[PDB]
Amino acid sequence: GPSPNLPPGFDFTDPAIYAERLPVAEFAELRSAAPIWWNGQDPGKGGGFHDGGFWAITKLNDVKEISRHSDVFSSYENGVIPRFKNDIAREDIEVQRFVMLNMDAPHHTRLRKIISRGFTPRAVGRLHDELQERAQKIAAEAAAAGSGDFVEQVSCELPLQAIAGLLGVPQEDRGKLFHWSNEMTGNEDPEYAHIDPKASSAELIGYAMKMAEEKAKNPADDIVTQLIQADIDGEKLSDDEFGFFVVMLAVAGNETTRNSITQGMMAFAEHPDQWELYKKVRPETAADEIVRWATPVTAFQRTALRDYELSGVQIKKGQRVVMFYRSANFDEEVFQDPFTFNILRNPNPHVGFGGTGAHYCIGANLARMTINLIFNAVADHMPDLKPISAPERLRSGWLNGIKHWQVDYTGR
Ligand code: HEM
Ligand SMILES: COc1ccc(CNc2ccc(Cc3ccncc3)cc2)cc1
Ligand SMILES: [Cl-]
Known part of the structure; x- marks a missing residue:
């Protein structure tokens, strides 16, 4: 059929778009007119990839x-x-292969099995009470400030405290852990142009390997002991493998949940009936509708290892496919009224945590609990908050981020 109505040369990974807006109309145009579409990229404009473009994947199925x-x-x-x-x-892309997210079977299979020790339901549930107490304190302190930056005063802290609690990081070290985590992402935004993710990753690996050594001597009931204690088959994370795990967690556990919270509250500010319902019922289905609406990871890619026909399109060996979760999470064939923010939506088969499969987000239930606990605390302590000015979006080609959002917590 006809080509999609998009500006010539439009690139759905272009950070300059996301610094201003989410290209929602453009995604919808692809879903209608070219649900799998070759996203060409000019020489030197591939965001680190030099293969001429990629297949944009816009449908949830x-x-x-x-x-x-x-x-x-x-x-x-x-x-x-x-x-x-x-x-x-290129070498700096490949160094990412040392975290499980960027590995294939069988290496991925072994690491995921080991790490599952640290994300058991019980391990995550043991964090519930401390995270709830921290959430209430966070919201109380914010409301006492009267007004300020919702991103910094409400959204930022609890995701980091969840990481710290899961890993058993001492309180006196959480400041520097938080700094290392914040130095990993956003380096294409002018506000973060001076961050050095490679240097921060090295410092965190050094910190993490020291922790692994210490926790081998004196086991504490975090996940670390489960991860570095050999099982019957001698399987365990080496000290450097634990280091790479902490790098992965410090990044994965921080800004995506933060941006879920900020954009969830933006959604509530745009849909007062849902906010009134939330405050009254506190439905935990809200967390998944918040993640679907926020889709904090706009997109992740894969590379075909062989020719593969996908929904009538011939993918060729070596080509990249980019899964636009931001498009799939508004797919009219899967969601009833995808552009209605509905905190009771159920079932809610969004792909904000990825598609089901080998790499499905191991942190999904930790993220959902963080989100439910902080929105309860916001409803308890600042039920009448009102935005003051527009959010500032993050310049990124794959993360949907909010840097700053001024709000009046007392709403007067
Ligand atoms: C709302 C917050 C979050 C979102 C939107 C999110 C998104 C995602 C997505 C899309 C994937 C898919 C990877 C793929 O298919 O290539 C994923 C995997 C992963 N997530 Fe999350 N995530 C969130 C929170 C977290 C948290 C809190 C943690 C840990 C504390 C975490 C740890 C991971 C890990 C380790 C993987 C890789 C799993 C593997 O490769 O086997 N994520 N996440
Ligand atoms: C130098 O060592 C390294 C190794 C790997 C990496 C990159 N790892 C990475 C990439 C993307 C995300 C985003 C995400 C958020 C939530 N859930 C899942 C994924 C998290 C971690 C950097 C430096
Ligand atoms: Cl609905």
Whole structure:
């Protein structure tokens, strides 16, 4: 059929778009007119990838199919982040293969099995009470300030405290853990142009390996002991493997949940009936509707290891496919009224945590609990908050971020 009505040369991973807006109309145009569409990229404008473009995947069923067929669609070959600075060295992309997110089976299979020790329901549930207490304190302190930056005073802290609590990081070290985590992402935004993710990753690996050594001597009931204690088959994370795990967690556990909270509250400010309902019932289905609406990871990619026909399109060996979760989470064929913010939506089969498959987010229930606890605390302590000015969006080609959002917590 006809080509999609998009500006010539439009690139759905272009950070300059996301610094201003989410390209919602553009995604909808692809879902209607070219649900799998070749996103060409000019020389030097591939965000670190120099292969001429990628297949934009905009339908949820296609995202699920790619995610399920990890034997064909590789995370390791080019990593899963679809956009870096245009001049990033290839070697700096490949160094990402040392975290489980960017590995294929069988290496991924072994690590995921080991790490599952640290994300058991029980391990995560043991954090409930401390995170609830921290959430109430966070909201109380924010409301006492009267007004300020919702991103910094409400959204930022609890995700970091969850990481710290899961890993058993001493309180006196959480400041520097928080700093390292915040130095990893956003380096294409002018506000964060001076961050040094490679240096922070090295400091965190050094910190983490020291912790692994210490926790081997004196086991504490965090996840670390489960991760570095050999099982019957001698399987365990080496000290450097634990280091790479902490790097992965410090990044994965921070800004995505933060941006879920900020954009969830933006959604409530735009939909007062849902906010009144939330305050009255406190439905935990709200967390999944918040993640669907926020889709904090706009997109992750894969690379075909062989020719593969996907919904009538011939994917060729070596080509990248980019799963636009932001499009799939508003797929009219899966969601009733996807553009209605409905905190009771149930079932809510969004792919904000990825598609079902080998790499499905291991932190999903930790994220959902963080979100439910903080919105309860917001409803308890600042039920009448009112935005003061527009949010400032993050310049990124794959993360949907809010840097700042001024709100009046007392709403007067
Ligand atoms: C709302 C918050 C979050 C969102 C939107 C999110 C999103 C995602 C997505 C899309 C994936 C899919 C990877 C893929 O298919 O290539 C994923 C995987 C993963 N997530 Fe999350 N995530 C969130 C919170 C967290 C948290 C809190 C943690 C840990 C504390 C975490 C740890 C991970 C890990 C380790 C993986 C890789 C799993 C593997 O490769 O086997 N995430 N996440
Ligand atoms: C130098 O060592 C390294 C190794 C790997 C990495 C990148 N790892 C990474 C990439 C993307 C995300 C985003 C995400 C958020 C929530 N859930 C899942 C994924 C998290 C971690 C950097 C430096
Ligand atoms: Cl609905």
